[PDB]
Structure formats: C-alpha cells, structure tokens
C-alpha cells in the first residue's frame, strides 16, 4: 500500500567501490575505495524491485524510468547499508518510492525512484531492432 | 571553468554493463534484459563530468558526485555507442552543477541534472579510512 515501507540490507564488499563502476575509467582508477553513486542507485532500484513484485504477471518485468537522489557521506567497504523503500503511487503500469539509504553511521542520501511495468518479451523484440 | 560550454563523452556500451552485470549478486538482476543499467548510466555521466572538470582541479584535488535527477527514456542493447553531453550551470566554490543528457545513435535515453564536489583525495581518503571497520 501507499506509505508502506520496505527494507533491504547490504554490507557494502570491496568490489563495489568507484573503481570497480568502471575499470574502463583511468579517470576513476585511483579513487579512493569507497561505495560508487552508480552501486547505490543499483541497491535502491533492487530494494524497489523486490518490493514490487508481487503485482507483476506472469510475463512482466519492470524498468527504472527515473532517478532523482543525494549523495551525502561516503561509505567505505565493510558497513551495512539499508535502503528504506517507501511507496508514494503506483497506477497501472506506473510505480514511484521515496529511497532512503544509511550506512550504520550516516545517513548517505535519499529521493525517488520510478519505474514502469514491461511485457518482457514485446519489450526484447524491441531491444533486438535496435541492436547491431 | 566556462559556464554554458557543453563536453561531450562516447563511449560503446560492451556486454559486462548490463543490468545483470551491475549486481551479479541479485537473482532478481539475473533475469533482466540485457541493456545498459541505471547505475552505470549514472556513473558514465559522472564520468563525462570527472572529465570536463580535470584540468581546472589543483594538484591532488578530485571530486565526488553529491547529487543526480535524470530520466531513462529508453533502453540500449550493447554494442551502440552512448554520448553523454554535460553543459556546466554553475561553479560556486566547491560545488559545480551540470545540466546532462545522453543518446545511444538511436534514441535519447535520459536527462536531467548532476552536482558534484572538490575534495581534496587525501585528505577525503585518510577521513574515510577511519569510518572503516
């Protein structure tokens, strides 16, 4: 329902640090090891993903349409952070939740996250058109 | 840094940045379709952004993205070439503001806006060391 809330745990692992985002980046390559902006918005689209499973179909999957969120202490590999998912509407094939995550020790940042509704298959046929 | 000057940053989406690929550890991942994820379009346009920065930092500074808001409009397969254009709004002191968008050659996938921070990486790295288990 509207205003419920659902919660997912993490301890954050060596291996999703910045550097591990994009070893591809000699621009990120010796950044210090602390939990990627990209791995944090991945935790909380997943916390949001387990919470809505329930209402697909058989045949359905979802995609994230949208992220809106701050970034506001760094958490280096060892802590546990929680993302606290709570749903603010969900109308059709139309989904959206506040996220909020905390690492133990601070607050690391919070927002919104949407997502949609997708027919998996109609969905890959689409993707195979685009695809070289 | 110029204000209203736009940097644009190219880069060909491989097979290991799909949805999967950014949580291996998430079975609900595992069954996704294989298109570039959120989490690696974020930090791609953090990335763009790191690069339009550089050789405006001292030495020994780098930054932190402390904020985005962007739409994912579409989705990409591997193999298409993602651009991400960063057009800088504003510098006041630490904080730069960036205004983003990226196309994959075929459609626009997401825009919005992204913040950052001058940090000094010592300095950050001795202070994250000590909240460390």
């Not at 010796?30 to 990627?36: D, L, N």
């Not at 991945?42 to 919470?51: D, H, K, P, T, Y």
């Not at 927002?111 to 997708?118: L, M, S």
Request: charge should be negative; hydrophobic fraction near 40%.
């Amino acid at each position: 329902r509207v205003g419920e809330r659902f919660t997912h745990d993490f301890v954050v692992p060596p291996h999703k640090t910045v550097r591990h985002l994009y070893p591809e980046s000699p621009e990120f390559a010796e950044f210090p090891e602390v939990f990627a902006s990209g791995f944090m918005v991945g935790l909380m689209e997943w916390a949001c993903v387990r919470a809505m499973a329930p209402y697909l179909e058989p045949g359905e999957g979802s995609l994230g349409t949208a992220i809106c969120v701050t970034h506001t202490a760094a958490t280096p590999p060892g802590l546990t952070v929680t993302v606290t998912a709570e749903l603010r509407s969900v109308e059709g094939r139309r989904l959206s939740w506040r996220v909020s995550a905390h690492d133990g020790v601070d607050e690391i940042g919070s927002g919104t996250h949407e997502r949609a509704v997708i027919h998996l298959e109609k969905f890959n046929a689409k993707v195979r058109q685009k695809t070289p």
